[PDB]
């Protein structure tokens, strides 16, 4: 199977950009799976940030559209998230996970419905403070 | 957004007793007959681990005591029997409409 | 839709239950107007739908009225071969 | 109604076979339009 | 007159916007009655 390991700053000064890189080990990011970011924080259940397909197309959570960008590095086999203007409200544990797809048809025409995040990493705890 | 109401916030049973945890979506998550309701076990200190996919299908490697059910917006997930290793916060997730949303989380504890 | 009753309820003959007096709204020369028509139909021509009845043929086809000026009396027909036969 | 998922109707033409087919067409077109030229295939123009 | 809605608003495929679920008051065998019919039409067949 494939394991996911995250790394990045666990402490970010308010209003700067957090950058998290998730390494994919044992699998291949350039495959028929979607990669995504999820966060958890006391008082808040899991909240989805966004997801990427190795073609570069990506979907984002409507409330974060102005602040979160994600990308895929095919040569490094890495999935990155850049979140700008971080606030105290953004303190959370950030997980990288693989979203399994039904692909009931020709992927060129869409025909994929997301079906379960089956592989999760361990989570990077990020506190916003200075 | 599709809002997921999860109930109870906390449920506890003694060992050997079956437990049911409910998830009520604000809207329908069934797309052309497939119920896109997912169910995860998040042990304290651990990431969530997918247990049930497409509402009732058990994920490979997950003990047979787990199963699901439901249609439209009303889903019921269950553990039969609950074992000592099942103490965890359990969440429901929808993939019917972006953004993806998660439930509040129900804490299953021994009693 | 027809609204039918038994034409005569007092019959002791084999016609009891046959021949119904059916009221219906039939069209007329102008599209805007309708006329109320009372007519007698044989039971075999009217089937209960749920009293409300329809013609037996509404289930399968349109009905063409025979021209009243054209007789149904059989006439002799001779068949004649073409030359060479 | 439709049972199951809704999927787009489509046609599938093999790339290798079609590419060979066009190669044959380009040489035969060149026999009438001249050699040392460029033959372009493009999608149809608008209309019904 | 047809009253149409998108058959499935949850599609993310190339088929989104195709296959409208149209309702109409259709005639029946008897001239005095009407029936409500729901049917699917392709987008190309129905004009607003
Ligand atoms: C024209 O050209 C295109 C371009 O390739 C080609 O596209 C492909 O179309 C097929 C359908 O026609 C798509 O099929 C689906 O593919 C997924 C993914 O397959 C991989 O993963 C599965 C397991 O996860 C492996 O078995 C497989 O080898 C691959 O590694 C499958 O998961 C889908 O499987 C379901 O449908 C099959 C169809 O019978 C079933 O046999 C299978 O058991 C699965 O059943 C599920 O769906 C059924 C209905 O769909 C349902 O009844 C079951 O209960 C169950 O839910 C499926 O094979 C394929 O992904 C497309 N490829 C691309 C581009 O992604 C077209 O097929 C081609 N068409 C013509 C005209 O020739
Ligand atoms: C007509 O007579 C038949 C005889 O069987 C009876 O069943 C039916 O109820 C009668 N209808 C009316 C309207 O009186
Ligand atoms: C004819 O139409 C009127 C309304 O114009 C209706 O009340 C009446 O019942 C109809 N007659 C029959 C026999 O159905
Ligand atoms: C109407 O037609 C069907 C076949 O299309 C037949 O089975 C049925 O008996 C018919 N109705 C009556 C009243 O005979
Ligand atoms: C069309 O919409 C109506 C709305 O009530 C629904 O009942 C019906 O099932 C829809 N048709 C199809 C074919 O899905
Ligand atoms: C079309 O389907 C037939 C089924 O036997 C298969 O042999 C053939 O290779 C297919 N052709 C293409 C171009 O997909
Ligand atoms: C159906 O989808 C099309 C796609 O462009 C959209 O414009 C339209 O508003 C949709 N209709 C409804 C009733 O949501
Ligand atoms: C059918 O006719 C009724 C008459 O009241 C009308 O309200 C309704 O909108 C019509 N249905 C359609 C689909 O046009």
Automatic annotation (TrEMBL), chain C:
Disulfide bonds join 4-22. Highly glycosylated by host. The high number of glycan on the protein is reffered to as 'glycan shield' because it contributes to hide protein sequence from adaptive immune system. Palmitoylation of the transmembrane protein and of Env polyprotein (prior to its proteolytic cleavage) is essential for their association with host cell membrane lipid rafts. Palmitoylation is therefore required for envelope trafficking to classical lipid rafts, but not for viral replication. Glycans are attached at residues 3, 21, 25, 50, 59. It is found in: Host cell membrane; Host endosome membrane; Virion membrane. Envelope glycoprotein gp160: Oligomerizes in the host endoplasmic reticulum into predominantly trimers. In a second time, gp160 transits in the host Golgi, where glycosylation is completed. The precursor is then proteolytically cleaved in the trans-Golgi and thereby activated by cellular furin or furin-like proteases to produce gp120 and gp41. Transmembrane protein gp41: Acts as a class I viral fusion protein. Under the current model, the protein has at least 3 conformational states: pre-fusion native state, pre-hairpin intermediate state, and post-fusion hairpin state. During fusion of viral and target intracellular membranes, the coiled coil regions (heptad repeats) assume a trimer-of-hairpins structure, positioning the fusion peptide in close proximity to the C-terminal region of the ectodomain. The formation of this structure appears to drive apposition and subsequent fusion of viral and target cell membranes. HIV-1 lineages are divided in three main groups, M (for Major), O (for Outlier), and N (for New, or Non-M, Non-O). The vast majority of strains found worldwide belong to the group M. Group O seems to be endemic to and largely confined to Cameroon and neighboring countries in West Central Africa, where these viruses represent a small minority of HIV-1 strains. The group N is represented by a limited number of isolates from Cameroonian persons. The group M is further subdivided in 9 clades or subtypes (A to D, F to H, J and K). The mature envelope protein (Env) consists of a homotrimer of non-covalently associated gp120-gp41 heterodimers. The resulting complex protrudes from the virus surface as a spike. There seems to be as few as 10 spikes on the average virion. Surface protein gp120 interacts with host CD4, CCR5 and CXCR4. Gp120 also interacts with the C-type lectins CD209/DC-SIGN and CLEC4M/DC-SIGNR (collectively referred to as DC-SIGN(R)). Gp120 and gp41 interact with GalCer. Belongs to the HIV-1 env protein family. The CD4-binding region is targeted by the antibody b12. The 17 amino acids long immunosuppressive region is present in many retroviral envelope proteins. Synthetic peptides derived from this relatively conserved sequence inhibit immune function in vitro and in vivo. This is Envelope glycoprotein gp160. The chain holds residues 127 to 222 of 860 of the full protein.
């Amino acid at each position: 199977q494939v394991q996911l390991q995250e790394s990045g700053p666990g402490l970010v000064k308010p209003s700067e950009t957090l950058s998290l890189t998730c390494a994919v080990s044992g699998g291949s990011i350039s495959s028929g799976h979607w990669w995504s970011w999820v966060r958890q924080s006391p008082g808040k259940g899991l909240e989805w940030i966004g997801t990427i397909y190795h073609s570069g197309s990506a979907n984002y959570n409507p409330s974060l559209k102005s602040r979160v960008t994600i990308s895929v590095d095919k040569s490094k086999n890495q999935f990155s998230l850049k979140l700008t203007s971080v606030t105290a409200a953004d303190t959370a544990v950030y997980f990288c996970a693989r979203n399994a797809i039904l692909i009931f048809g020709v992927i060129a025409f869409g025909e994929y419905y997301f079906c379960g995040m089956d592989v999760w990493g361990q989570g990077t705890t990020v506190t916003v403070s200075s | 957004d599709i809002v997921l109401t999860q109930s109870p916030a906390s449920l506890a049973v003694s060992l050997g007793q079956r437990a049911t945890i409910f998830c009520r979506a604000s809207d329908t998550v069934d797309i052309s007959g497939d119920s896109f309701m997912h169910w995860y076990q998040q042990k304290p200190g651990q990431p969530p681990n997918l247990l049930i996919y497409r509402a009732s299908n058990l994920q490979s490697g997950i003990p047979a005591r787990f199963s699901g059910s439901g249609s439209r917006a009303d889903f019921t997930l269950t553990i039969d029997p609950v074992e000592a290793d099942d103490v965890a916060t359990y969440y429901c997730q929808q993939s019917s409409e972006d953004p993806l949303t998660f439930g509040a989380g129900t804490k299953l504890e021994l009693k | 839709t027809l609204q039918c009753t038994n034409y005569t309820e007092k019959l002791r003959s084999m016609m009891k239950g046959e021949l119904k007096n059916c009221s219906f709204n039939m069209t007329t020369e102008l599209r805007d107007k309708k006329q109320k028509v009372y007519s007698l139909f044989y039971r075999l021509d009217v089937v209960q739908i749920n009293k409300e009845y329809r013609l037996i043929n509404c289930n399968t086809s349109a009905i063409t009225q025979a021209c009243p000026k054209v007789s149904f009396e059989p006439i002799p027909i001779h068949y004649c071969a073409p030359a060479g036969f | 109604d439709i049972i199951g998922h809704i999927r787009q109707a489509h046609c599938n033409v093999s790339k290798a076979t079609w590419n060979e087919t066009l190669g044959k067409v380009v040489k035969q077109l060149r026999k009438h339009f001249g050699n040392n030229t460029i033959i372009r295939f493009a999608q149809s123009s608008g209309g019904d």
